[model samples]
Target: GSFVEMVDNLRGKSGQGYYVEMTVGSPPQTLNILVDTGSSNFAVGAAPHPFLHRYYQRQLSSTYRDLRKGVYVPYTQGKWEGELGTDLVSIPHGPNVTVRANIAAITESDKFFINGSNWEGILGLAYAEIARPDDSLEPFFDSLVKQTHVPNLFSLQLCGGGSMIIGGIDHSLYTGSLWYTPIRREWYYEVIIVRVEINGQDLKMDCKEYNYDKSIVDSGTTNLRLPKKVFEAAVKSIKAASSTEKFPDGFWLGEQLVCWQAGTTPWNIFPVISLYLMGEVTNQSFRITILPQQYLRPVEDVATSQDDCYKFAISQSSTGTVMGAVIMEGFYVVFDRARKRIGFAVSACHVHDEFRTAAVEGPFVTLEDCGY
Candidate 1:
């Protein structure tokens, strides 16, 4: 039996995050949890929820055991500090399919930033290396494979509305061919990116260490993050080709944001971003393309009540490149840990000619139905 969970793209929250529903405890307390691939820590009680729907109360689980040790989960923005515990975590696969496993819980949380947000906790999807060092716990996916006969593979079809299939791939969700690249490292869904191009021009960066080139394909991150030099080069290339008037606000959050009027031809103005990767096992090069629509999203301002300007952000990160949901929304991605490989294929979210066929064949689902 395979597990398929519905991942709803959060349009109202950040327009960048997505969450899945899961049950934790013996009686089952439901929670809307963010799927994070950048770290591994199944934490709860970070956010305040409605009276009827609340965070995981450790006392509610009969199988809960207090380790009496505190754990801290760090993010690029903030950090979560709490005590460690153990309990059963269940994910609903279908009507009769449910996968349950043990999880290292985070109780008595402090300094969590889930206020006014829909999600209460986060389910870390990365490897054990990124989990808390002191009380390291295997990720939920890995536990599922050990406890059950499920395959060590999971697919994330992000944005719009998408479904996550664990233990298998849905041929109906993707089209063309699935391209595979070896996982450069096991810490994150790390991959070797040989080249980064904007409008067919190669991007130059000072930090080119093989380790630095090992990018983390993170679903939790909101936007694509590149090295300082690469980020600048990409922004310059887009600004040079695009109309100055379209990009009213040049940057946001210490990054570049390209916006335009609703009716303008964004494709003609914006350049296509491409990432080339050399397969460590096959010694072959493959490219992933990101079009203007994939990177340029629509955002409304309450003051103006107009769709005149779009919302787009690409940032510079000292940590290295993070292939976030912004660029990933254009592709169907698979994290095949069993083979130490990651797979990608063009998505049907864009209204291209091939998208028509993709939709007919049951393409990747997106709830928004318009843009990423």
Candidate 2:
């Protein structure tokens, strides 16, 4: 028996996010929750709010046991606060193993739940290191593994959507050879990146700037977030090489969309972006690339509209490089914790022959052996 299920993908539901449906409590209350790899608290709405259809009413669940603690998780824009409790949880469409899991019953939020969003809560897929309240509380995925006796690995294919497997890889969801890279650290699915290129031309910044803090493949984030210094230079390279026309400030900041006359393909003016990584177990290198259509994303939800509006899918993060859906939608990503490594294979959902790109072109730089 494998813990496999289709994500209740809300990619076209607007506000742009992805989620998985799961059953909670004895009688089974269902919730479509946001799946976040950058965090750990499995939180859901507990109070009535305009943006959500319904909240998780603990009073209705006979198996609910109060943990009697307050919890808070802050994000880049907003935060959620709630009371913690435990309940018998299971993914109705997944494995049959039910377990007592800690639940953050979110009662209040500020900008965390926006209008037009389809998800009600967040299921953090990262390690317990980023879990709220403390690391003593185990994550839902851990509980699943402990009970199912499966390998501690999971894979995500996030589009029409996609599917997620908690036990092992599903080769059908992806194509081509899988590329492996060792985890730089366990805090997040963090990794080390050695180069950044635009349209095959390197950004030319010191390699140190690429991994100023660290890089991660975080699905919870919607855009490809970059460090401030790196973001500015990358944009400069794309604009300079792709077009002479000036894109608006709001467009570059991810605050606005750029539209063109109907029937016109405006996305062609953008350039391709590539990221090179040090070999997972060696000093060798290889590259992963994303095309213009991936970065200058089309507003798929904007149906019957006059202009073909596109959203700028790259943003600045003071933290580090975050390869969000903007870049990840091009591949099937595996968080293979059992091997202390991550794998990237071409995803079946959106692969295009004209758009696909890559690399086996490294061992280009020798970065080594100094005790820092």
Best by lDDT: 2
1-372: candidate 1 lDDT, tens digit per residue: 334333322222225366777778878888777777877777776334342146777676797777777776666566667776666777664222344543555444444535445667777888888778542666777776787767788887775456677777777667788878778778888877666667878765432531254578988877778867677677778778775444444453433434344455445656678777555344355778777666665555665444345566477778878888776777788999999999888764543332222211112211101000
* Best-matching candidate per TM-score: 2
Model 2 scores a TM of 0.91
Q: What is the lDDT of residue 21 in candidate 1?
A: 73
- Per-residue error (Å), model 1, residue 79: 1.5
- Per-residue lDDT value at 170 in model 2: 81
Which residue runs does candidate 1 get wrong by more than 4 Å?
1-16, 46-53, 74-76, 94-112, 204-213, 243-261, 280-283, 300-304, 351-372
Query: Each model's RMSD to truth, in Å?
Result: 7.0, 2.8
CA lDDT for candidate 2: 0.75
Q: Judge candidate 1 against the unseen true structure and give its global Cα lDDT, from 0 to 1.
A: 0.64
Error of 1 at 247 (Å): 3.8
Per-residue C-alpha lDDT of model 2 across residues 119-161, encoded as one tens digit per residue: 7888888878778888887888887787776678888777625
